Design a binder for this molecule. Sequence first.
Ligand SMILES: Nc1nc2c(ncn2[C@@H]2O[C@H](COP(=O)(O)OP(=O)(O)OP(=O)(O)O)[C@@H](O)[C@H]2O)c(=O)[nH]1
Ligand SMILES: Nc1nc2c(ncn2[C@@H]2O[C@H](COP(=O)(O)OP(=O)(O)OP(=O)(O)O)[C@@H](O)[C@H]2O)c(=O)[nH]1
Ligand SMILES: Nc1nc2c(ncn2[C@@H]2O[C@H](COP(=O)(O)OP(=O)(O)O)[C@@H](O)[C@H]2O)c(=O)[nH]1
Ligand SMILES: Nc1nc2c(ncn2[C@@H]2O[C@H](COP(=O)(O)OP(=O)(O)O)[C@@H](O)[C@H]2O)c(=O)[nH]1
Ligand SMILES: [Mg+2]
Ligand SMILES: [Mg+2]
Lengths: 24, 429, 426, 431, 440, 117, 44
Amino acid sequence: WPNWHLTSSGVAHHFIPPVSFPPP
Amino acid sequence: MREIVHLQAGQCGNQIGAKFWEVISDEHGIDPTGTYHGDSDLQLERINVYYNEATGGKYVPRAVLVDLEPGTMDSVRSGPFGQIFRPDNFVFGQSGAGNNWAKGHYTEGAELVDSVLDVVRKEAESCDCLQGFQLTHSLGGGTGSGMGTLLISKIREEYPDRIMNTFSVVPSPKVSDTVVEPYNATLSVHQLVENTDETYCIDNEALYDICFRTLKLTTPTYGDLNHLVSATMSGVTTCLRFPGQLNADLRKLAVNMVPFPRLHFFMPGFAPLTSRGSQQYRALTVPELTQQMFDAKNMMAACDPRHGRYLTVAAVFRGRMSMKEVDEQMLNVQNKNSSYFVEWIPNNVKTAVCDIPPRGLKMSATFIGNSTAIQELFKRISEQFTAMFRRKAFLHWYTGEGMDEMEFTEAESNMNDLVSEYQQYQDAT
Amino acid sequence: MREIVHLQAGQCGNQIGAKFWEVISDEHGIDPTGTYHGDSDLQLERINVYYNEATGGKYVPRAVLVDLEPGTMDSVRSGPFGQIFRPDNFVFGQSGAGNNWAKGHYTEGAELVDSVLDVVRKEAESCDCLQGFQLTHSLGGGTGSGMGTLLISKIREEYPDRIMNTFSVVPSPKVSDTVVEPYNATLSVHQLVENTDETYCIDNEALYDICFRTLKLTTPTYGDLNHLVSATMSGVTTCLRFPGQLNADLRKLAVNMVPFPRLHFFMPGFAPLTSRGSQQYRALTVPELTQQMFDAKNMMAACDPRHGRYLTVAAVFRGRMSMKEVDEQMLNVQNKNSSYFVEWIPNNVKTAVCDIPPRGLKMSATFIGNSTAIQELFKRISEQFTAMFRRKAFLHWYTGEGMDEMEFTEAESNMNDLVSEYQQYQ
Amino acid sequence: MRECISIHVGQAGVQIGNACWELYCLEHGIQPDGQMPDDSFNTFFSETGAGKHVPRAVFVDLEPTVVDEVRTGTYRQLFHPEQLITGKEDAANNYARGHYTIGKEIVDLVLDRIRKLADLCTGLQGFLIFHSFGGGTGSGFASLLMERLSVDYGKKSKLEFAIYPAPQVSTAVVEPYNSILTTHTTLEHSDCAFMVDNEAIYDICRRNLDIERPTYTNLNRLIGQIVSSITASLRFDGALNVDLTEFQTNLVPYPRIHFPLATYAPVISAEKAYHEQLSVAEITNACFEPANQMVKCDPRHGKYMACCMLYRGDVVPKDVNAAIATIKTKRTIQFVDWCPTGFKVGINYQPPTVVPGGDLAKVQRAVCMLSNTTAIAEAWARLDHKLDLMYAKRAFVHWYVGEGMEEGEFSEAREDLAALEKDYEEVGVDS
Amino acid sequence: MRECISIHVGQAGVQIGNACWELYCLEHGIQPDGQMPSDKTIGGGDDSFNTFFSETGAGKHVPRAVFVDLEPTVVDEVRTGTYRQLFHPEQLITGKEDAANNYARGHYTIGKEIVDLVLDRIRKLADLCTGLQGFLIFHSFGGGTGSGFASLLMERLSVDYGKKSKLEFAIYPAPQVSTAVVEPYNSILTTHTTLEHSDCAFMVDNEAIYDICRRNLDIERPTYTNLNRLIGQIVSSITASLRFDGALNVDLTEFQTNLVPYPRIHFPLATYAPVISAEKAYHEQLSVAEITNACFEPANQMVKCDPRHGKYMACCMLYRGDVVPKDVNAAIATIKTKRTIQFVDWCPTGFKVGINYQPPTVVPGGDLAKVQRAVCMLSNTTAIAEAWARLDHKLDLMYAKRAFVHWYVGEGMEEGEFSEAREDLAALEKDYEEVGVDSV
Amino acid sequence: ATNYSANQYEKPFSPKYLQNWSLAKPTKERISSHEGYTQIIANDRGHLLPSVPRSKASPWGSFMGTWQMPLKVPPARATLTSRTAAGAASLTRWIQKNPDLLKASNGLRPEIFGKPH
Amino acid sequence: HGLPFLPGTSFKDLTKTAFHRSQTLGYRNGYAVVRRPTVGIGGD
Ligand SMILES: Nc1nc2c(ncn2[C@@H]2O[C@H](COP(=O)(O)OP(=O)(O)OP(=O)(O)O)[C@@H](O)[C@H]2O)c(=O)[nH]1
Ligand SMILES: Nc1nc2c(ncn2[C@@H]2O[C@H](COP(=O)(O)OP(=O)(O)OP(=O)(O)O)[C@@H](O)[C@H]2O)c(=O)[nH]1
Ligand SMILES: Nc1nc2c(ncn2[C@@H]2O[C@H](COP(=O)(O)OP(=O)(O)O)[C@@H](O)[C@H]2O)c(=O)[nH]1
Ligand SMILES: Nc1nc2c(ncn2[C@@H]2O[C@H](COP(=O)(O)OP(=O)(O)O)[C@@H](O)[C@H]2O)c(=O)[nH]1
Ligand SMILES: [Mg+2]
Ligand SMILES: [Mg+2]
């Protein structure tokens, strides 16, 4: 997928993994 | 000393019978090999009601499997209890009926009926004192509606003073399984109204609702609906095979149930049915059976009993219980609901109690209800019939098989008179 | 013996009934799984008032959970006590009312009322001698108010002699939670006047005031608000479930508090409430209980009794307390406030004492009061209703399902007649 | 027992039967050389003395090319060499050549082979005819076979699985003549006639399957799936068993109206079954959708008269009951006055068999729908108009008069089809 | 149950639904491959996804949303982007030529083109619904397919479904900035036909969200993506009561009863209270009483109109997260004691409240900060009538000379509907005048 | 066809619980009673005899497609309260403007509830 | 803490973040199905 940095919808909507919120 | 010869007609009758005989053999401790490996001693005392004895300790049921084509018996013989039938009792031909009443009554049913009655006479003369016969069939198909009624017609002439019982699967209000169902239903009802002594109308969607609301089985099979039917079929003959503090055979229920000879269409039921997850929230006493047999959503006939009046009601209780509670509940139901019972009969409930319950159960009861709310089952079939017959919708497959236009009209008149009779006895003062 | 068939309708009804069954099951020592674990014989003797006998020493409530959308009873079942109810008692439809009285009374409420009538018939005809029914609902909602009114109207024509109580939640004065709330309140009071035996009016604003000032709760939830209503509900029927020096059931409170058939709206209260740092400052005496029971800052409705006159007062006491002290406190309260009690009734207070208190409390008392200050609660709804009906504010969502415009006129005429009738005795 | 004889006429019949018998061989354990490495095959195969199973099929063509392709192909050891009948010159898109001049010299040999295939019959359920409405032999000789089969074998079921001329796509110029003549002569001698057309299967293969530019093999595989679903109750276990005689007493109300439609429900590609469930309710309603029919007509512009439901796979009877009960409530599906009952339901357990090199997906459930509808009167009026265009000044008639056929046969066929049009119109009027 | 079906029509609809469905996959455990991660539990588990996701026999989830456009360009980045495996292929319907900012192209020639396929797809998606609340429509007033095809779509939806709830979401024409020049014509013609067929029309506009992202969030130069994310947050807050446990639930039917008093006044304005950056969350509280007042601030509105210029007819406050109902009651009580905020005479109640426990989630790479409380405010006000005056002036400026009309009359439309739509909007303006007059 | 009533089991078979979330066909609530037998009114091939009366409704159904559907179809709900009498007259003239939509198999089923000023 | 169940003796768990509800009471072919619950609020 080279649209991560070429189109607006690619940089806008690509998967960044969520982080677990509450610290131990 | 009161033995019963069983007749199975058509594929519906065969699929019902293959489960009914498993139920009866589980009750009496008979393995699929035919031998006895039971536990108690009362399982042999009246085992000759349904089973014949053979040399070698093997028990053979008194069943005559009748169908016009041997496709269904290949599935029957490969079942869990297909080896226990005598191979000579299977009667079949070479050509199917094609859901045609004429093909199962006149054209292709004539060459099978002589050998069927040969087997029937063979199984009815080995009896010492014959109580009566049974028939499992459906009124929608072709061989179960045409051949079975021919068997009943030519058995009633042979044995006029023996009881004759039918467990007919009458057609479906909502969705049908056969396009030609009104013709076969009307003609087979016309044959049944002059020939049989009791009839047990059972609808498929009533069984579906029972399965999904009461039992809450997520995926019905047909082997569960046949189980539900065969529980009631093996519930009306428990006073013949087990001791009781109040016995009732087929003849006593026949005398007490029908008040007039042409009104013998009943509504089966089963009391202690309950869900899998609702066993911890429920008790099992006599009022809990009483509130379940008289619930409208427990009938197997898919007709609301609150739209008419009960003429007579049966109740065959099984297990250890007190006659005080049973009789008090039977009186209580009649008293608290006075509009649904006819006023010109002081007691509309017949009571019978056996001792031995079904295996793995405390108590059980079987409801047999003669109601005037069965008339719309005939009215719907009659008006579907007049929707089809006046246009000659499918009649060329019957008139082309040697039939006449008069037979359909005779069937319609005989069913409309039944509807008029039930309406007259519903509104009588 | 003498059983109560509990009925709950709507989200408010379900969320209050869950806490009510919580309090009742604690009072009789019932496990979350449904078994018996109480430590006294008296917890079993009158367990048949609310519960049904199941197999294996298990007890199930006689509740009937009714909703037009199962969103609230789904959250009820996922709690700590959601598995004790019988699965056949839950009744749900497919489409909600949407805070509309007509959707819950005429069109979507009519496709479900049969399946509720079958369940309540099953749980009423399986009774030794049924005493009465209880309804928990709210008058501001669509399925709560509308379906509760339809359910009461259907029940009353089947059992025209038993008790029918309603622990309703009337709308708040300051902040409304529904825009169309006075329409539903008027159309529901028009049925409650003509169809119920008792009605306990509860405002959420009064519960907020109790939890803020009296209880000193910085962040209270709705469960704590429903706990007070459940305590009020349990304190009324305490003579049915436990013995006493002077017993009083529901009908005895009905006779002793309702002088005329159209005046049956009460303001409840719970007596032993204390702040979180003030328990060490209080002496557990009867005069403290009777002084806090009659206080204007303890009523569960937003109408202090100084705006009218007390027609009758019921005070059901719980605990081991002397008769002379309770009677002399009642007499002193009546004598020291001459103007606020009606002069044509010589004794305006009906009392009852039971031995067994709530566990953890030495004494407890429940205030039930019939006052002519409840007509200012109807006047607020009447003027908020006539501020909208004059210009037909939201009528097209009510006449769209076939309601006549004369229904609102009849309801407001009955409200005005009720207000005038309450003003007659003041 | 439960035995059926397949008769394939013409190029379309032989090329359909190739896919049909591949599906039959793979659905049983029949290897392509005739060996089996159980007697459920007895409905279509007969066991010889050499351990070789031989199909109950007669491949008939008046042109050697396609039958010689069969004889050279992988299935040459499976077929008995006399079963594949061959003429020398074909009819060449002429109904009269396949009915009066060429086909009359091959008909007796085909009947001899049919009789020789009817003596291995304990109980004969009926025949299956595979032909096309537009070809020469597939119309003329296939119609010639019916008039002799009806008078020789009596009243047995004779199903014909026809290929209909499409509204737009056509190959032969003269094919309206062939279609009208072959409908006029087959009207009495047929019991049921399952009709599909090539254009609708083209549209399904483009839209449902992701196949741009498919060929005739992809259509033949779908037709073979229909045939396998029709006779799946004679070879496999069934909760509700359907014989071949049950179709003609449910789908054919009147002796002339014997033209039902055909619909296979879960026709989807292998990449689309991952994205959806295929429960019974989701495949029952897809049969009544106009985009899944196999004749290019819209049933919503007509009325229903009969419906045969052939479920197949892991189904539940109540799922079928609820799915059919939902359909009766829909306003778009509208039945007729004189049929208040609608449906015939069949249920079988064995799932459909996946063919390697086919384009379908390994489904868990499948439905085959056979509906008799009034909306097919569009196709009759359209074909009628197409014939009326050419016959108005006697085009291509000299090729037919010159081959043993009187010119007055066109006219009477045309007015009999006018009677058929009035028949289709007059059963939709209520009272 | 409680199923909702989303219909994204237009380029604005698709680019909004991208953010909305990325959000929806983030509330639950749904990954872009269409499946959750592995089981984590013996037997049954969560079923909160059934509001928006239909699940097959294996564990894959399919969105209940139809993506529609007449132009193949915008949808094809969903077919090739990250979420290509999540959507059913037949759920993304495209055309070949678009409407080209023409209402009649999207309503009479290319509108009737594709309306049967999306209707069939809606029927197939509504057949999975055990309990269906209502339809959600996302479109823009200025588009050709967002105005023409959406109008015909809700038209045939009302024909085929009766009284099913049709909550539509619109991008209103901004007062100053705009993209197209035929935009007032499209807005007029899409209001005239859907004046009845829409149950309630929740509205936002781009310029106010631009101002919000300028002042509240610390982003110079926002783009359409931040706007789509804020709109997705609003939609998530609206439907959160069908999926999460709360103290005061609200269905989709309650909005149309507590917000629409009269059969034509169904254009409320959306507001989201705690939209602040992470660099400013370190300093201030986000309390219930503080951010309740931030809803009624004129600068925080999501429609560029002044609430001081009209009267508040009704409100629908949708609280979310760790909210204590006593603080809710105190804040709404202290709102009514202000002279800047004025209410109509015939609504003495004014407020419909809702409380949900689930706090808003954090989209990675997003702009909003993680907060414990959130308010979504739905206000029906008379102050919208000054936007209709500006829109009417914009139509009348180029309708006097009848410019850009040959693209409409020449292609599949008469001229009389222009005059008729002008009469309808003028009647609506007079209605807004009438309902704002106090019966003193 | 005719939809019959499972007289005690009609609740699961009503169309809203069968996942049919649109307008559906009515179900019969009662069945008439007739006596005697029926005359044949049609000969072979399904044609009606000339002595019987027919129905003026055209065969092949009454179905309204997309391009046969009128532009500007009338309202679905169509309430009349809080309306000027002239405007309510305009709305009911709009509803009764096209009768062909009101008598199609699929179409509009409007109910006109309430009264204007 | 073994406190009596009285109005006010409740303390919420503020570290709990998931508040998802299940569909315990669902539907079937035409029947109001009722399922035995396996998870609470949040999925635990
Ligand atoms: N479904 C299907 N139809 C075919 C196939 N091959 C030919 N057809 C149809 O057959 C029609 C023409 O008739 P054919 O079967 O090819 O030839 P014929 O019937 O033997 O007649 P003659 O060529 O004169 O001998 C064409 O219109 C095709 O639609 C095929 O492989 N599959
Ligand atoms: N909030 C928001 N608005 C958008 C977005 N994209 C376009 N718009 C608005 O949509 C308006 C133009 O209408 P579009 O939706 O783009 O056009 P369309 O629906 O594709 O119709 P056609 O272009 O004619 O095919 C512009 O004025 C924008 O304000 C977006 O991503 N977010
Ligand atoms: N209860 C029950 N009914 C059955 C079964 N098999 C078939 N039927 C019924 O049989 C009816 C059709 O009759 P049919 O099978 O054609 O009778 P046939 O002539 O013997 O084949 C249908 O309405 C089915 O409901 C079964 O196993 N159980
Ligand atoms: N005091 C109190 N009021 C409640 C509670 N739950 C809901 N309510 C009230 O119920 C009203 C909303 O009506 P609701 O019951 O949700 O409508 P319904 O679901 O159709 O019955 C609001 O005015 C709330 O104040 C509660 O737990 N306590
Ligand atoms: Mg050829
Ligand atoms: Mg565009």
